[PDB]
């Protein structure tokens, strides 16, 4: 029939390049016969604060409330807040998830951060049994599309701000891959606010061209979970024999699994 | 007679996070500190940047840009009063303690929003004064983080990976960027599977540390003097500093790894 | 706690239980280091009728006068009547607002009703941009303290008068929450004039005990405004996908958002 | 030759509310009604209950209670003359029309005050005779409300919530409590966004309705016969009526929802 795509947008202004890049992605994907659902978080007045109000039924323990535990029960028993559930249905349907946002304080905007917190509940988005490459969204692909005010030189190995690969790691590994997603190469649009209108149009056309064949792309490299002992008594440490195979190599596996050695160039930006 | 701000991002008074805020307040007051708080959930703090944050005339309502508009609003004094209140707390504060649970490898959304609305240009950073030359070089900040995951999971060989990498965007990208000297984070791992007697110990450990907090060495970040702070040079590391570093085996920091090894616990232990 | 509290009182007699409960609240709060400001509306000879006299400057349109529009301009340009402005300053300062009044005709007294009408002006207390949980007083907490002549059985589900939750809804949702307030559990003191002296003393002591730790209480549940399309073309209706998630559930969200189903027990009286 | 009272709570003669008062007067006179008015703003009506409302000897000036004192003052005939004047209008009136703009989900303060000062015990209610057995069971009342908000906002799925809930305290708690049979309210939503052609239609609709107003079915309120009207029983619903209602899916009314569903438009449409 054709595949489904979710576009999460974290910018308040319709006049923004971020909004322009959401519209371009929708356009490009529909024209290739994709169904396209959106979460325009500001337009939705999405609520990004985790609270008791997120559970609409009986709390297991109202006197000693813990959001991890309570939210998971509420999912299983089906009395999560309906605004959460609506976003979860969009994700279950979605084969590709595009996150369009401006980098703010080296991270996702608060409203997108809150979306992850309220929507990516246990049992739904991760278990513990099944982390990382074995997680519930291993069927799905995700891509970050980020704009910055700072130039790309500032996020180079020798830039004042430092390696962009380090900045992306918590989001791409810690949030997206943790839940199973195969993470595609991020679309980095540097110093957008010093780019003249003719060149922005080019960037949009570049973005649209990429989305034509997005599904065929190689994902970023993360250490398979098979390299680790996935149980508590072992501490989720990297297997003793994998440490032995890696002792000799000069490069580490990834930004987070640098292993006290060099990080593979553009681990979080380019695939191999 | 120094001042301390405690920012707390947890909704429940029954939490260990709340317990660690109370312990810090206690310990600091007893050493003659003034202690101001921002309990963000109790304040029902609003973490979403919007036009409503500027209370006066916009420079350009048809083409609104939060960076530029917020900065004018600071200079002309028509920021939203809830923002201004937090800024006054910071101007007064010598030490800032951020108490929060790690959520999705980061600060909670409400604390993230606080940074976004409160750390406005000209007030918290300019670009002519970045990093060690920034407006808060007089001040010290420390993260106090709790996790659900065990510390083995955030070791070099842990499933989740090096905690130094996770802390970098916050400690360098937000705190140091604005000038703060960043102290060793208080990392309290897998708190919900720590027995009661050991939690009591952790609180007492926290209180003991805060007695002599001010004397501590800060974490190492590359001085901005190692870089060409102008656009034509690209804010790249000076050509002669690259020459001095060519030979060394370790990089400077997590973000300035320079394609080499990261100094062990760059974001966790001081030099 | 160097926090501020406003106590609005709508009873004419100093000999009243209502006055006794104002005094008890002031006592209890001061002793916990609160600043306490009062609006004793009868003692102030407060004027509760909206008129042109409420605007002291130039009317925008004297031939076709509309209090909503004119009052809002007068706030922005700073020429509201000084008696209104005085009350507004009390509100801006106040973290907690306590309304102490006798139920009169299933509602607030006329003088308190007038206070709402003259003091809760647009831009100050509400905009249509920011309604309900996004409103200007989301930082503040409010509580109703109501006395009745009728017994509590009369306002039970099977009482002659009917559910008290229905009676409170217009005030707590329509007035307090509309302006942003987090609304705490109302203090309902039923049939006070047929309570023996020893039990009245108990009620006062109960009230004082509650106010010690008032700030830590959970607020009443109102449907978040994030469940709705906050714009005119959509009709401020509940989002289409939230209605889909709620179609199946047996209980409605609140007294006003009952959705043609059962109302959550004591939605306007107890928190969850 | 029946009589009608029109109570109006709007200050401006240029208002749609005033236009709807004039239309009702017109329509009713033309059908041979006598029409008395209470234009509360024009009367400079005083809506605050005070001691000044009793003009004779108080029973207990040191411990004053408005319920008790006002009732004695009615029986002994020394109520304030402005109250008495309004009471005479009510005694004469067969139909009472309340024309007002919704203000804060309620009647305006001045109309609220009118109820408080005019609807005194013994005159408008006793505890002997509440609801359908009350003194005004001979009379009919109708609310004519204008709103600024659109009707979608007061639908089951509207931001503001069910308008049936909003009307309940007024129609049941004030009007029916005193005996009135309450007719379907005339709801004129978002009048200030209605073009002139459609306003003319609404007025004509109002006038057409008033021609045959007296024949209309009233709104459904639970008869007081479903309850034990005595204090020892607590004015609770009879044990055998609860038994008849156990099985039904819909409750009786908005206030007597009985923990179940409210009958659709209980306070807006007759059954
Ligand atoms: C709180 C906060 C923190 C921040 N922190 C960081 C940080 O840590 N690091 C960092 O690098 N940056 C940071 N920034 C900067 C931020 O990343 C940039 O402001 C953002 O990336 C710019 O993207 P935009 O879509 O908002 O741009 P806009 O300025 O909204 O858009 C750029 C230009 O494109 C124009 N345009 C829009 N659509 C079109 C179209 N279809 N065709 C042609 N022209 C078009 C616009 O009118 C405008 O002139 C921060 C900003 C904020 C508010
Ligand atoms: C949305 C979300 C995302 C998350 N993502 C991550 C993630 O990416 N990585 C990660 O590692 N974790 C994650 N977590 C987990 C989070 O780090 C932990 O839940 C948190 O750190 C636990 O601290 P707490 O204060 O919340 O614990 P609590 O359960 O509130 O406290 C722990 C125990 O201490 C007790 N206690 C309370 N006060 C005292 C006292 N005074 N003295 C002694 N004992 C006391 C409590 O009663 C309880 O038994 C996430 C959680 C959420 C909600
Ligand atoms: C116009 C009007 C309409 C009304 N409509 C309704 C209605 O629709 N529904 C309804 O249920 N009720 C209604 N009522 C009744 C009203 O709610 C009650 O009369 C009111 O709540 C009683 O409170 P009070 O403070 O006036 O009581 P009071 O009678 O003034 O006080 C109660 C008792 O407590 C004593 N007392 C005072 N101070 C102290 C103290 N410090 N310690 C101990 N004892 C003390 C007093 O002397 C007295 O004996 C209405 C009343 C009016 C005037
Ligand atoms: C303090 C306060 C609180 C409020 N609270 C609420 C609330 O909680 N909820 C809510 O929904 N609303 C609320 N409102 C708004 C109120 O409900 C509306 O403003 C009011 O109902 C609109 O009717 P009006 O008579 O005032 O209209 P107007 O605007 O005075 O008149 C309506 C239009 O009809 C025209 N018109 C006048 N006479 C005629 C005629 N003879 N023929 C044809 N056209 C004519 C007028 O010129 C105008 O264009 C509140 C208002 C105030 C002042
Ligand atoms: N990390 C951050 O978020 C960050 C840091 C610094 C600056 N900024 C943003 O960048 C702005 C910097 O402005 P500025 O005063 O430094 O000037 P500018 O950088 O916008 O213009 C001057 C410089 O631009 C460069 N440049 C390259 N191509 C150019 C072209 N075609 N035309 C003109 N200049 C060209 C040149 O090196 C020149 O020295 C800030 O106002 C802010 O918006 C963001
Ligand atoms: N709810 C309450 O508690 C309360 C309290 C007091 C007053 N009120 C009432 O609420 C009113 C608030 O006014 P409002 O916010 O409803 O005004 P509004 O936003 O409805 O007025 C502007 C209208 O014009 C339309 N419009 C104009 N140009 C347009 C265009 N080019 N394309 C599309 N649509 C266009 C807008 O969509 C909108 O419907 C007050 O004046 C008062 O009457 C309500």
For this entry, give a set of tags.
homotetramer, 272 residues, alpha/beta, Rossmann fold, six-stranded parallel beta sheet, 7 helices, globular, binds flavin-adenine dinucleotide, flavoprotein, NQO1
Order of SSEs of chain A, N→C?
A: EHEHHEHEHEEHH
CATH architecture of chain A: 3-Layer(aba) Sandwich
Count of helical regions of chain A: 7
| DSSP summary, beta strand count of chain A | 6
Q: Biggest interface, which chains?
A: A-B, 71 and 71 residues
CATH topology of chain A: Rossmann fold
Assembly type = homotetramer
Count of structural domains of chain A: 1
PDB class: flavoprotein
Keywords: NQO1, oxidoreductase, redox mechanism, flavoenzyme, flavoprotein
Assembly: tetrameric
Entry title: Human NOQ1 enzyme in complex with NADH by serial crystallography
Written description of the protein model:
Chain A is α/β, with parallel strands linked by helices and 272 residues long. Chain A has one domain (3-272): 3-Layer(aba) Sandwich (Rossmann fold). Chain A contains seven helices and six strands; from the N terminus they run βαβααβαβαββαα. The first copy, chain A, has helices spanning 17-30, 67-76, 82-93, 110-119, 164-176, 197-212, 240-246; strands at residues 4-9, 35-40, 96-102, 141-147, 182-183, 187-189. In chain A, strands 1, 2, 3, 4, 5 and 6 form a six-stranded parallel sheet that branches. In chain A, α1 runs parallel beside α6. The longest helix of chain A is centred in the C-terminal third of the chain and has 16 residues, at 197-212. Chains in contact: A-B, A-C, B-C, C-D. The interface between A and B is large, with 71 and 71 residues. One flavin-adenine dinucleotide sits between chains A (11, 13, 15-18, 20, 102-106, 147-150, 192-193, 197, 200-201) and B (49, 63, 65-67, 116).
